[PDB]
Design a protein around this motif. Structure first.
Motif, mmCIF file in Angstrom:
data_model
loop_
_atom_site.group_PDB
_atom_site.id
_atom_site.type_symbol
_atom_site.label_atom_id
_atom_site.label_comp_id
_atom_site.label_asym_id
_atom_site.label_seq_id
_atom_site.Cartn_x
_atom_site.Cartn_y
_atom_site.Cartn_z
ATOM 1 N N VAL A 105 9.980 10.796 -2.323
ATOM 2 C CA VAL A 105 10.254 9.377 -2.924
ATOM 3 C C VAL A 105 11.137 9.530 -3.987
ATOM 4 O O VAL A 105 11.159 10.526 -4.832
ATOM 5 C CB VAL A 105 8.838 8.760 -3.001
ATOM 6 N N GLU A 106 11.817 8.378 -4.417
ATOM 7 C CA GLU A 106 12.852 8.345 -5.332
ATOM 8 C C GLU A 106 11.905 7.837 -6.770
ATOM 9 O O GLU A 106 10.975 7.084 -6.328
ATOM 10 C CB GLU A 106 14.099 7.686 -5.375
ATOM 11 N N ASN A 107 12.479 8.289 -7.734
ATOM 12 C CA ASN A 107 11.791 7.814 -9.099
ATOM 13 C C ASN A 107 10.289 8.166 -9.237
ATOM 14 O O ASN A 107 9.557 7.322 -9.729
ATOM 15 C CB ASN A 107 11.954 6.314 -9.245
ATOM 16 N N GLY A 131 0.831 -1.277 -0.114
ATOM 17 C CA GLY A 131 -0.178 0.146 0.153
ATOM 18 C C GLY A 131 0.966 1.221 0.165
ATOM 19 O O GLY A 131 0.177 2.285 0.037
ATOM 20 N N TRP A 132 2.094 1.056 -0.199
ATOM 21 C CA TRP A 132 3.135 2.251 -0.101
ATOM 22 C C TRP A 132 2.925 3.343 -1.079
ATOM 23 O O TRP A 132 2.726 4.431 -1.015
ATOM 24 C CB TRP A 132 4.454 1.856 0.016
ATOM 25 N N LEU A 133 2.833 2.639 -2.473
ATOM 26 C CA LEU A 133 2.643 3.645 -3.533
ATOM 27 C C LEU A 133 1.025 4.565 -3.210
ATOM 28 O O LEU A 133 1.233 5.880 -3.480
ATOM 29 C CB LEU A 133 2.377 2.974 -4.838
ATOM 30 N N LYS A 134 0.320 4.006 -2.708
ATOM 31 C CA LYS A 134 -1.105 4.844 -2.452
ATOM 32 C C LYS A 134 -0.839 5.780 -1.408
ATOM 33 O O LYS A 134 -1.373 6.876 -1.518
ATOM 34 C CB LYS A 134 -2.334 3.742 -2.340
ATOM 35 N N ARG A 135 -0.054 5.385 -0.340
ATOM 36 C CA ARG A 135 0.052 6.393 0.623
ATOM 37 C C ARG A 135 1.178 7.558 0.043
ATOM 38 O O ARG A 135 0.977 8.665 0.654
ATOM 39 C CB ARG A 135 0.874 5.774 1.831
ATOM 40 N N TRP A 136 2.038 7.194 -0.800
ATOM 41 C CA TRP A 136 2.980 8.266 -1.247
ATOM 42 C C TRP A 136 2.279 9.232 -2.106
ATOM 43 O O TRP A 136 2.649 10.645 -1.885
ATOM 44 C CB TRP A 136 4.160 7.628 -2.250
ATOM 45 N N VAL A 137 1.488 8.997 -2.888
ATOM 46 C CA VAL A 137 0.509 9.908 -3.625
ATOM 47 C C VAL A 137 -0.281 10.650 -2.811
ATOM 48 O O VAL A 137 -0.234 11.737 -3.136
ATOM 49 C CB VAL A 137 -0.461 8.963 -4.777
ATOM 50 N N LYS A 138 -0.851 9.941 -1.808
ATOM 51 C CA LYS A 138 -1.672 10.811 -0.791
ATOM 52 C C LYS A 138 -0.879 11.719 0.009
ATOM 53 O O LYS A 138 -1.542 12.809 0.442
ATOM 54 C CB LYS A 138 -2.494 9.769 0.094
ATOM 55 N N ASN A 139 0.439 11.412 0.361
ATOM 56 C CA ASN A 139 1.194 12.245 0.982
ATOM 57 C C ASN A 139 2.196 13.201 0.000
ATOM 58 O O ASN A 139 3.247 13.745 0.531
ATOM 59 C CB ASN A 139 2.150 11.530 2.116
ATOM 60 N N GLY A 140 1.912 13.386 -1.065
ATOM 61 C CA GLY A 140 2.797 14.235 -2.044
ATOM 62 C C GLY A 140 4.070 13.738 -2.372
ATOM 63 O O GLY A 140 4.962 14.482 -2.432
ATOM 64 N N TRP A 141 3.997 12.603 -2.454
ATOM 65 C CA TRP A 141 5.330 11.901 -2.907
ATOM 66 C C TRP A 141 6.496 12.175 -1.893
ATOM 67 O O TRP A 141 7.405 12.521 -2.545
ATOM 68 C CB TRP A 141 5.643 12.175 -4.258
ATOM 69 N N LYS A 142 6.269 12.167 -0.796
ATOM 70 C CA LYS A 142 7.133 12.249 0.502
ATOM 71 C C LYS A 142 6.916 11.253 1.387
ATOM 72 O O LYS A 142 5.856 10.533 1.692
ATOM 73 C CB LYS A 142 7.090 13.511 1.066
#
Ligand SMILES: [Mg+2]
Length: 139
Positions: free
Chosen positions: A94-96, A80-91
């Protein structure tokens, strides 16, 4: 409506270094191989790129079973990390992000399940790996 199985692999010599990616797409007895090269990249980037390119090779929306040796990829999708990254503005960042944005788009077009393989694991991932290495050698 098709269920397509995709085997992906990426390889790079160093951090950064020359890299390649490969994917094998399978639908019954039909097969499609793709691969490519990147002159300065990382293993993680080539792992993601293989999945991106594999999914981009589908001509129509599909159900996909995607087999990768990349924990980086598979954990992001299955924990579920990708979905959380998006939700938190890619922080912190996040690399790449460029590649993750592509994977977000492609996993809307296609309904993808991701599977981690252990390395060697089967002849189809092995072929994908060979194709990635092939791309590096050709360049
Ligand atoms: Mg891989």
């Amino acid at each position: 409506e098709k269920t397509i199985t995709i085997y992906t692999d990426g390889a790079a010599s160093g951090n950064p270094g020359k890299g390649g990616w490969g994917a094998l797409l399978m639908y019954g007895s039909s097969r499609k191989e793709i691969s490519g090269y990147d002159p300065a990249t990382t293993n993680n980037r080539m792992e993601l790129m293989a999945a991106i390119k594999g999914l981009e090779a589908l001509k129509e929306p599909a159900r996909v079973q995607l087999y990768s040796d990349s924990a980086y990829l598979v954990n992001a999708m299955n924990e579920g990390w990708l979905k959380r990254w998006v939700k938190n503005g890619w922080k912190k960042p996040v690399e790449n992000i460029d590649l993750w944005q592509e994977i977000l788009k492609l996993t809307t077009l296609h309904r993808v399940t991701f599977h981690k393989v252990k390395g060697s694991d089967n002849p189809y991932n092995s072929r994908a790996d060979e194709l990635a290495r092939l791309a590096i050698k050709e360049n």
